[PDB]
Nucleic acid binder design. Structure first.
Ligand SMILES: Nc1ncnc2c1ncn2[C@H]1C[C@H](O)[C@@H](COP(=O)(O)NP(=O)(O)OP(=O)(O)O)O1
Ligand SMILES: [Mg+2]
Ligand SMILES: [Mg+2]
Length: 429
DNA sequence: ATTTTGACGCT
DNA sequence: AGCGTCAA
């Protein structure tokens, strides 16, 4: 009753760029704008692998991971932009730099947690408190929320036939119901959060040209889920009260962290399909099947409650470079292995030197990882060494030294299907 | 031959 | 420390 926490203490947003790498390339090349477009890496093997797809191309069925030759079978007029290749490998610098543009804009509004190259969480609790104080009892106009959806609305009792009509009808129902007079109202706090996110998204688009979607809720899992509900170029508010109906038909795998083996086990062991069905288990039952940590997390999450903080971290914690060597291209000679370690180490050196100048820090550990032909696991072996000098020849030599005894017997066997260098354990400089 | 990353958990 | 999970 009066003591049941409801996980309504925070306002959290997740901002995710729409078809991000495609938009970077469309900004650079106006010929690609408003077209079915994709970004591809490599070209010789089946036209290259698609890693990003414009919404116009998705309408034809083009997806991430498709070979470009096959995408062309679905979408003959598909336009393609190629990832830069340097030193024999795909080089993602352009997208990392565009990411920095967006992150630097978002951080003007609030503390952000960089969650991936194109998305960040925002803890808006303090900003909402401030805006509620400058704005005192003044109602919030629908004009302040021109691209916001209220999940679950409209409900109940003809513009309803088109999607913008429905959006406005749901928003009107929501705002009509709001009580602006209580500064402690969670629903009001979320609404002010959404106003701020509209401002943030407008700033991102104005200052970079890039469009994005966003979720606004009380925690990161719900913000992330909300964000995906009305992509692209829209934002979605998931209130605490919307959770029971939303979760009643939500496949377990759609919640972040449950998309893999753990989610599959939740489905298989409990014989359920949707997140809401989890409410019928005690915390102890869930802990018994999935462990203390997972059990408690699931017990709270299925009720819309999660406490994971927005971490104050705008910069990546590691800087890595990897290359796969599939099928017949697997590395089978000592010289091959050393040459590719050098290529990787040279890209890594460039990125580390820039990072040291920009961010006043230095990496102190080098992690070397390899995969052997036949092993399905991403990494077959991982070994570390000291990272004491930003020198590509030294880093590549040290990596060879730490992995050379994996070679069973001038020849390398079994052939290597992946090399990976990662700089870790940063200290201030 | 789904590539190139990145964060965090378990022991 | 080294491996495993999940993710974009
Ligand atoms: N498996 C993968 N491998 C390589 N790059 C990937 C990737 N998944 C994503 N990327 C890269 C390429 C992507 O552009 C970028 C962001 O990933 P998203 O946010 O998952 N997808 P996007 O922004 O394209 O579309 P929208 O969000 O509107 O659905 O990260
Ligand atoms: Mg995105
Ligand atoms: Mg994303």
């Amino acid at each position: 009753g009066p003591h049941m926490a409801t996980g309504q203490d925070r306002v959290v947003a997740l901002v995710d760029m729409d078809c991000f790498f495609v938009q970077v390339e469309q900004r650079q090349n106006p010929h690609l704008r408003n077209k079915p477009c994709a970004v591809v890496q490599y070209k010789s093997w089946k036209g290259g692998g698609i890693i990003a797809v414009s919404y116009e191309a998705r309408a034809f069925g083009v997806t991430r991971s498709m070979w470009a030759d096959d995408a062309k079978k679905l979408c003959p007029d598909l336009l393609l932009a190629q990832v830069r290749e340097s030193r024999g490998k795909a080089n993602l610098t352009k997208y990392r730099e565009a990411s920095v543009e967006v992150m630097e804009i978002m951080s003007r509004f609030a503390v952000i947690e960089r969650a991936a190259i194109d998305e960040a969480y925002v803890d808006l609790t303090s900003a909402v408190q401030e805006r509620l104080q400058k704005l005192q009892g003044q109602p919030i106009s629908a004009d302040l929320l021109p691209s916001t959806y209220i999940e679950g609305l409209p409900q109940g009792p003809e513009e309803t036939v088109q999607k913008e009509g429905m959006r406005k009808q749901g928003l009107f129902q929501w705002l009509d119901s709001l009580q602006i007079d209580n500064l402690t109202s969670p629903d009001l706090q979320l609404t002010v959060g959404a106003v701020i996110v509209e401002e943030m998204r407008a700033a991102i688009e104005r200052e970079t040209g890039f469009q994005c979607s966003a979720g606004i809720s009380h925690n990161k899992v719900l913000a992330k889920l909300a964000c995906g509900l009305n992509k692209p170029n829209r934002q979605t508010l998931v209130s605490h009260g919307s959770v029971p109906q939303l979760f009643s038909q939500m496949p377990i795998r759609k919640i972040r962290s449950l998309g893999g083996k753990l989610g599959a086990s939740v489905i298989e062991i409990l014989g359920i399909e949707y997140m809401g069905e989890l409410t019928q288990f005690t915390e102890s039952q869930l802990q018994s099947h999935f462990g203390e940590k997972n059990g408690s997390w699931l017990y709270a999450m299925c009720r819309g409650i999660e406490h994971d903080p927005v971490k104050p971290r705008q910069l990546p914690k590691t800087i890595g470079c990897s290359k796969n060597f599939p099928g017949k291209t697997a590395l089978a000679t000592r010289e091959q292995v050393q040459w590719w370690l050098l290529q990787l180490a040279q890209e890594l050196e460039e990125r580390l030197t820039k990072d040291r100048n920009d961010n006043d820090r230095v990496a102190t550990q080098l992690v070397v990882s390899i995969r052997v032909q036949g092993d399905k696991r991403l990494s077959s072996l991982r070994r570390c060494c000291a990272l004491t000098r930003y020198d590509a020849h030294k880093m590549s030599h040290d990596a060879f030294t730490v992995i050379k005894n994996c070679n069973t017997s001038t020849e390398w066997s079994p052939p290597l299907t992946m090399l990976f260098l990662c700089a870790t354990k940063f200290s201030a400089s």
